[PDB]
Enzyme design. Structure first.
Site, PDB file in Angstrom:
ATOM      1  N   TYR A 138      85.908  26.700   0.500  1.00  0.00           N
ATOM      2  CA  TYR A 138      86.106  25.669  -0.518  1.00  0.00           C
ATOM      3  C   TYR A 138      87.537  25.132  -0.408  1.00  0.00           C
ATOM      4  CZ  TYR A 138      87.808  23.880  -4.985  1.00  0.00           C
ATOM      5  OH  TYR A 138      88.437  23.127  -5.946  1.00  0.00           O
ATOM      6  N   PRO A 190      98.302  18.308  -7.433  1.00  0.00           N
ATOM      7  CA  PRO A 190      97.111  18.656  -8.212  1.00  0.00           C
ATOM      8  C   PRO A 190      95.951  19.193  -7.380  1.00  0.00           C
ATOM      9  CG  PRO A 190      97.158  16.319  -7.879  1.00  0.00           C
ATOM     10  CD  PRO A 190      98.494  16.846  -7.387  1.00  0.00           C
ATOM     11  N   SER A 194      95.678  19.576 -12.520  1.00  0.00           N
ATOM     12  CA  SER A 194      94.448  18.849 -12.230  1.00  0.00           C
ATOM     13  C   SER A 194      93.602  18.657 -13.483  1.00  0.00           C
ATOM     14  CB  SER A 194      93.627  19.615 -11.189  1.00  0.00           C
ATOM     15  OG  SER A 194      92.317  19.081 -11.070  1.00  0.00           O
ATOM     16  N   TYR A 203      91.504  12.243 -13.689  1.00  0.00           N
ATOM     17  CA  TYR A 203      90.257  11.868 -13.027  1.00  0.00           C
ATOM     18  C   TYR A 203      89.491  11.195 -14.160  1.00  0.00           C
ATOM     19  CZ  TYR A 203      90.039  14.663  -8.608  1.00  0.00           C
ATOM     20  OH  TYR A 203      90.147  15.203  -7.346  1.00  0.00           O
ATOM     21  N   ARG A 248      81.473  17.638   2.133  1.00  0.00           N
ATOM     22  CA  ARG A 248      82.038  18.829   2.752  1.00  0.00           C
ATOM     23  C   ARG A 248      80.913  19.808   3.060  1.00  0.00           C
ATOM     24  NH1 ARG A 248      85.979  17.333  -0.997  1.00  0.00           N
ATOM     25  NH2 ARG A 248      85.547  18.905  -2.611  1.00  0.00           N
ATOM     26  N   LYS A 293      97.512   7.769  -7.059  1.00  0.00           N
ATOM     27  CA  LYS A 293      97.315   8.656  -5.916  1.00  0.00           C
ATOM     28  C   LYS A 293      96.029   8.363  -5.137  1.00  0.00           C
ATOM     29  CE  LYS A 293      97.058  13.714  -5.021  1.00  0.00           C
ATOM     30  NZ  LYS A 293      95.604  14.034  -4.876  1.00  0.00           N
ATOM     31  N   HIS A 314      93.570  12.853   0.442  1.00  0.00           N
ATOM     32  CA  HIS A 314      93.034  14.024  -0.247  1.00  0.00           C
ATOM     33  C   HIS A 314      92.902  15.237   0.668  1.00  0.00           C
ATOM     34  CE1 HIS A 314      90.951  14.664  -4.251  1.00  0.00           C
ATOM     35  NE2 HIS A 314      90.734  15.827  -3.663  1.00  0.00           N
ATOM     36  N   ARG A 330      89.621  15.799   2.695  1.00  0.00           N
ATOM     37  CA  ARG A 330      88.436  16.309   2.002  1.00  0.00           C
ATOM     38  C   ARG A 330      87.463  15.254   1.497  1.00  0.00           C
ATOM     39  NH1 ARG A 330      89.076  21.467   0.306  1.00  0.00           N
ATOM     40  NH2 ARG A 330      88.242  21.281  -1.832  1.00  0.00           N
ATOM     41  N   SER A 358      99.058  15.446   2.318  1.00  0.00           N
ATOM     42  CA  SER A 358      97.983  15.548   3.308  1.00  0.00           C
ATOM     43  C   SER A 358      98.433  15.943   4.715  1.00  0.00           C
ATOM     44  CB  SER A 358      97.167  14.247   3.369  1.00  0.00           C
ATOM     45  OG  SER A 358      96.506  13.990   2.138  1.00  0.00           O
ATOM     46  N   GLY A 359      98.310  17.235   5.016  1.00  0.00           N
ATOM     47  CA  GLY A 359      98.673  17.740   6.324  1.00  0.00           C
ATOM     48  C   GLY A 359     100.012  18.444   6.457  1.00  0.00           C
ATOM     49  N   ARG A 399     102.680  21.221   6.509  1.00  0.00           N
ATOM     50  CA  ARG A 399     102.700  22.676   6.654  1.00  0.00           C
ATOM     51  C   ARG A 399     104.081  23.218   7.054  1.00  0.00           C
ATOM     52  NH1 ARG A 399      98.705  21.096   4.888  1.00  0.00           N
ATOM     53  NH2 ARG A 399      96.530  21.696   5.266  1.00  0.00           N
ATOM     54  N   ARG A 418      97.334  22.647   0.121  1.00  0.00           N
ATOM     55  CA  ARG A 418      96.941  23.963   0.610  1.00  0.00           C
ATOM     56  C   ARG A 418      98.116  24.910   0.902  1.00  0.00           C
ATOM     57  NH1 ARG A 418      93.660  20.413   3.330  1.00  0.00           N
ATOM     58  NH2 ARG A 418      91.382  20.513   3.098  1.00  0.00           N
TER      59      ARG A 418
HETATM   60  C1  FMN Z   1      91.061  23.331  -3.056  1.00  0.00           C
HETATM   61  C2  FMN Z   1      91.567  21.924  -3.245  1.00  0.00           C
HETATM   62  C3  FMN Z   1      91.319  21.237  -4.530  1.00  0.00           C
HETATM   63  C4  FMN Z   1      91.811  19.900  -4.822  1.00  0.00           C
HETATM   64  N1  FMN Z   1      91.644  19.345  -6.096  1.00  0.00           N
HETATM   65  C5  FMN Z   1      92.205  18.157  -6.444  1.00  0.00           C
HETATM   66  C6  FMN Z   1      92.185  17.646  -7.854  1.00  0.00           C
HETATM   67  O1  FMN Z   1      91.615  18.277  -8.743  1.00  0.00           O
HETATM   68  N2  FMN Z   1      92.906  16.421  -8.086  1.00  0.00           N
HETATM   69  C7  FMN Z   1      93.616  15.629  -7.074  1.00  0.00           C
HETATM   70  O2  FMN Z   1      94.184  14.643  -7.370  1.00  0.00           O
HETATM   71  N3  FMN Z   1      93.604  16.112  -5.785  1.00  0.00           N
HETATM   72  C8  FMN Z   1      92.988  17.274  -5.470  1.00  0.00           C
HETATM   73  N4  FMN Z   1      93.122  17.827  -4.161  1.00  0.00           N
HETATM   74  C9  FMN Z   1      93.926  17.071  -3.182  1.00  0.00           C
HETATM   75  C10 FMN Z   1      95.408  17.429  -3.262  1.00  0.00           C
HETATM   76  O3  FMN Z   1      96.024  16.886  -4.367  1.00  0.00           O
HETATM   77  C11 FMN Z   1      96.191  16.968  -2.039  1.00  0.00           C
HETATM   78  O4  FMN Z   1      95.940  15.527  -1.844  1.00  0.00           O
HETATM   79  C12 FMN Z   1      95.788  17.567  -0.697  1.00  0.00           C
HETATM   80  O5  FMN Z   1      95.488  18.947  -0.760  1.00  0.00           O
HETATM   81  C13 FMN Z   1      96.935  17.360   0.266  1.00  0.00           C
HETATM   82  O6  FMN Z   1      96.680  17.920   1.593  1.00  0.00           O
HETATM   83  P1  FMN Z   1      96.973  19.315   2.172  1.00  0.00           P
HETATM   84  O7  FMN Z   1      95.973  20.230   1.527  1.00  0.00           O
HETATM   85  O8  FMN Z   1      96.874  19.268   3.669  1.00  0.00           O
HETATM   86  O9  FMN Z   1      98.379  19.598   1.699  1.00  0.00           O
HETATM   87  C14 FMN Z   1      92.601  19.149  -3.745  1.00  0.00           C
HETATM   88  C15 FMN Z   1      92.815  19.844  -2.446  1.00  0.00           C
HETATM   89  C16 FMN Z   1      92.360  21.171  -2.149  1.00  0.00           C
HETATM   90  C17 FMN Z   1      92.703  21.747  -0.800  1.00  0.00           C
END
Ligand code: FMN
Ligand code: FMN
Ligand code: FMN
Ligand code: FMN
Lengths: 353, 353, 353, 353
Positions: free
Chosen positions: B23, B76, B105, B128, B162, B228, B252, B255, B282-283, B285, B305
């Site tokens: 997940y 978030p 979130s 949201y 996904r 965002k 995101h 995802r 996004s990305g 690390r 992440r």
């Molecule tokens: C497990 C998980 C849950 C997420 N839930 C939300 C959310 O509730 N609201 C939101 O704006 N973005 C959500 N995101 C996106 C993150 O805010 C962020 O854009 C994204 O994780 C950035 O990329 P990265 O995981 O490579 O750092 C989620 C990402 C992951 C991995």
């Protein structure tokens, strides 16, 4: 776990004899072509338009001026009966339930007339010319039985060198039939009926079919006519100049010439030059592949192996399932890129990589 | 051996149930997007400025006009309580100890009010919109409890496909809770309270939320507002035109749409066009990924992440450790490229590859 | 089977303890840098000039105005005594037998004076500044003992993040010694001798050493002075402007900053801009790598790990063997591309890929 | 399963001793060259011309003004007798049966005179100059025995560094013979016959053979003269300026210089500049590779390892089979791209990738 086209390929490979699976999945020579057909879609990525109301989306669209549920068609493929019993009818019925056209191959296992009698959806006929006279017979047969569109396949002047078949000494299944060539008499002797019989006793087609020959076919057929197998804006334009109502850019799913370009490489140019409907196939597996082509100007996308995996894996229901997944896939993609109406797709949603 | 973010991912994978790990780590469809999000950073390399006094370095910087320890934020993410008990609070407290904002979130496991009562750091709220009225309730709730900044997530008009979740039939953990939607009554009957209840019984959000809807939200919220999920300089600019104080370029974390561009691809253009704060995620690390974005004009980088691996692996302390490593990483990188003050970063330190 | 540098690396890995091998072979963070240092040479291919008389070839060349057997040098590397007993002397003697300079590290296991007393070849001294006063002591020491050239290494303001060492908790071997810092007294109390002692009790160097500090060093040293660790034509030019007689483009063999560019990326530009000797290192393993750099304008190439593999594998004889292979390699390449005299190398023999 | 050249390589590897297989398949140093020779063909893809009558195709073509069955030749390779008994004659006879030239190596196992007496096909002689006087002897010998064309190989001034041979301590087979150097007397003493004997006791050739030396050879030979081993339009043009009737762009199958460009990289430029016959080899395995070069202007393509796999695997019949497959391959490709007459090939059928 059947959530995408790849999942169906995997199931099809488990259910089909290796020889049949190789006949379906195989490509020409080194198979760099089929790999390229897939890889080329990565040359484009999406640039979604946010804050657009996509609560009401439409995949409906006109293809050659006629509306259908979505810009997809099940393209012409031979020996479907080798993948699943009455495969041709299974595919035709699934296409009709989905609201899209089905194209019957000249090398189908079910005849032109029989399918027309068992399916009332939009049926198209793909023509292969081995013998001019015989071809004329099939064309009129398709006309009289209600086929709406004729498709001339031009990329098989000679048979592709598919080494998987060579290794398996692939022989057209024993329970199969080239129905459309059934009852083409014999016992007759004279110029034709001897020149015609010898042409039928050959696995090669009419390698001389040229532009003049196309004009011939153009006057013979009254409805929509498309030329399939093109790989240049120049040829696409020439076809329109000769009477064609549209074209189908294709490299035959990488089964004819391993080093051929992907039709995606000349799609935009063909759209800009011809100004006429430009359909396309070869390599499409994901809804995003389809949306990328549509965004580049394609009128519609024909499915080849994608829906065949559903057929070989689970018959008619399998085809229904693949079409359902692809439609939802296309729908989902349109929503995520901010283009609620499929006919509003433009290159503005793409980024060249 | 926990010397970088990857080391924490490895530990998180050993401690989390496969379904939960999938997940968290999973992406949309083929996951070419998450791979691209990582790969795109290799399009830039460093050209250090030697013989510069870097004995005194500063990572301090202003984000939306307010100073914080470093240009990072814990972004978030939903269902953090599924990764670690009271995950939302663990993350919030680690962020505060580090001197950076934490974004809650709308789908968090701890409510807006509770976190505000248990953490006195800079708290942001990610919105949201499923129901306009319900959204308005959360917005005012965040305003009254002291949240400093509101973030509207616009890239989930529809849920991402996904396949890992599909294969695991992923179901939101039993001990988890969508706290923010708690106590939204029922038993009521009439237009809303029936149209609202049906909206809550749907896993899909308001796919109609558009530009006009953004203006609505703009007048409702008095403090800093960010949009965002943008992937174009054009949309970023439009948001500024509609009242936004800044934007967050994001796909995101790969995802939502597998073939979406990486926000890094439009970062410089968005900075040049909007002339307003441009945040990004996004990305990310490595500290170098972060420094590359900052050098291209990003106001700050949100972690997704990265810090979640610390949380799932070792709770609050784990988050503290990841932030400590990243800060030292960023610090080390600034020194090695000859840019002692983080706010002095420019494209002059980069080389396009 | 020892026919190239890779063959010696393989032997060195079999003979060295893993911790020592990792100290030698390891790079910073993900090690994308060391991989890039190697890969970048593939951006150039040869376009040989046929029908040229290459029966009489010459590898002889002037470096900083002084002739040597070939445009190579054994660069500065620390803790050579950890790879092989009296490694510093083994390397120095092999270099002298080959007719090229050897550069002694500030962190060598054999002192400046001892090597000068045991080797009469062209000895260079690489300076690291931890304490200005201490550095001045080593500089004068090198001057008085006969070192011909001084090299200031500027890319270690902070220590590189090499995770292999972190995983092995790498600790400088027990039988090793930082000879050059030997006898720097103690027991003294006052400003320095307390500020100096604390600087020596730190594994970090003078991160404040800047351009003004370089001028200081320039007036202190009377002979040839080179600045090492540059990665831009701009810095190379600035060094010449400040008194340097030449520079050494380098990313420290990918051991300091993983995402740094390869010095090969700015070689031609540095040659064109500075108009002064431009030396280079980082990633050289094959004679072709060397010839490509020389063809792009490099005065000479410094060897790092290449000759260290010979040392760790077979001591002094090992270094002799690697140098013999490389010289024959360079010679063979010059013949095959039609450039009998090494000083006649130009970009005309290359093709950008 | 022998359906292509790769199938024959596989069989050849199973039948040949490893040392001999490595002598044949091996390349210089890292073998990035042989890999590049193959990979470079992927830089071009086909854009077939549809609706062209290809029922009557012709592969016939003129090479240096003389017609042959197809634009192919079996190029010069040494020690063929090590791959198969009387390999030189097997190759020569297969080439003649196919209607194409065979080029005899100066290092063949069968002498110039013997092959001319046992084969009446178009025989060419490839010259290597070790001793001017000895070379003159072979040239006149080839002239008097009826060889139609002379080919000067210029890319072996020094022997390539092929590490496979080094690892196998490869020694020219015991039952083999350097026939062309047979009976070159001895027992004589004086300037030559002592300077000549010492030259024969050396595995290296005349590294001084230059442009003036080429003029010398030009006046000595009356018929067609080609210079082989060129990798630049400039050298190709210079050869024409010095009397050559054409050239052979080649990197010796990646056996001399690992980082050399592929001759395909300068093919079009050489064709445009020289305006004379430009032949080419190195890396050709598929009929498409051949067609791509022909389309870029090549007069003909010489086969190296391709036909050697047939020889080592199945002798003369093996060579016949490879040539049959390649011809049908070329024929099939011409049909699929819509170019019935091989002499009509142009860059218009290609797409740069
Ligand atoms: C497990 C998980 C849950 C997420 N839930 C939300 C959310 O509730 N609201 C939101 O704006 N973005 C959500 N995101 C996106 C993150 O805010 C962020 O854009 C994204 O994780 C950035 O990329 P990265 O995981 O490579 O750092 C989620 C990402 C992951 C991995
Ligand atoms: C098993 C198989 C049989 C085919 N038979 C025909 C045929 O009879 N007529 C035709 O026009 N194309 C034929 N095609 C080509 C398809 O119409 C279509 O161009 C191709 O499959 C598209 O590529 P894709 O398989 O990647 O979707 C065949 C393809 C396959 C895989
Ligand atoms: C084990 C090891 C120790 C090093 N120590 C030093 C040093 O003390 N001083 C210095 O200027 N560079 C030092 N370097 C960097 C080298 O001078 C040189 O820049 C680098 O090794 C070149 O790259 P290469 O290893 O790919 O040849 C070291 C490199 C290695 C591999
Ligand atoms: C085993 C072997 C021996 C060779 N001997 C010679 C030779 O004696 N004379 C010559 O001009 N080229 C020689 N060549 C080079 C070939 O003429 C030709 O350039 C090369 O093989 C072309 O590449 P390919 O092997 O990929 O087809 C040899 C190549 C191989 C593989």
């Amino acid at each position: 776990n059947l959530f995408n086209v790849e999942d169906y390929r995997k199931l099809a490979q488990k259910r089909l004899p290796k020889m049949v699976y190789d006949y379906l999945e195989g490509g020409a020579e080194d198979e760099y072509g089929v790999k390229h057909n897939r890889d080329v879609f990565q040359q484009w990525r999406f640039k979604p338009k946010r804050l657009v109301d996509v609560s009401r989306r439409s995949l409906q669209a006109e293809v050659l001026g006629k509306r259908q549920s979505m810009p997809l068609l099940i393209g012409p493929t031979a020996l479907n009966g080798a993948l699943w019993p009455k495969g041709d009818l299974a595919l035709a019925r699934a296409a009709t339930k989905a609201g899209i056209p089905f194209v019957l191959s000249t090398a189908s296992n079910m005849s032109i007339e029989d399918l027309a009698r068992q399916c009332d959806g939009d049926l198209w006929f793909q023509l292969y010319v081995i013998h001019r006279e015989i071809a004329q017979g099939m064309v009129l047969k398709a006309l009289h039985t209600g086929y709406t569109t004729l498709v001339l396949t031009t990329d098989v002047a000679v048979n592709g060198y598919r080494e998987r078949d060579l290794h398996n000494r692939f022989k057209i299944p024993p329970f199969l039939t080239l129905k459309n060539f059934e009852g083409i008499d014999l016992g007759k002797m004279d110029k034709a009926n001897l020149e015609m019989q010898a042409a039928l006793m050959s696995r090669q087609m009419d390698a001389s079919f040229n532009w003049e020959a196309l004009r011939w076919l153009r006057d013979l057929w009254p409805h929509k006519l498309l030329v399939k197998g093109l790989l240049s804006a120049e040829d696409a334009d020439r076809c329109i100049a000769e009477g064609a109502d549209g074209v189908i850019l294709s490299n035959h799913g990488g089964r004819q010439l391993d080093c051929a370009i992907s039709p995606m490489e000349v799609l935009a140019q063909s759209v800009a030059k011809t100004g006429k409907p430009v359909l396309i196939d070869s390599g499409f597996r994901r809804g995003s592949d389809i949306v990328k082509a549509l965004a580049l100007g394609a009128e519609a996308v024909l499915l080849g192996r994608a829906t065949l995996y559903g057929l070989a894996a689970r018959g008619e229901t399998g085809v229904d399932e693949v079409l359902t997944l692809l439609k939802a896939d296309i729908d989902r993609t349109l929503a995520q890129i901010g283009c609620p109406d499929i006919t509003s797709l433009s290159p503005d949603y793409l980024q060249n990589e």
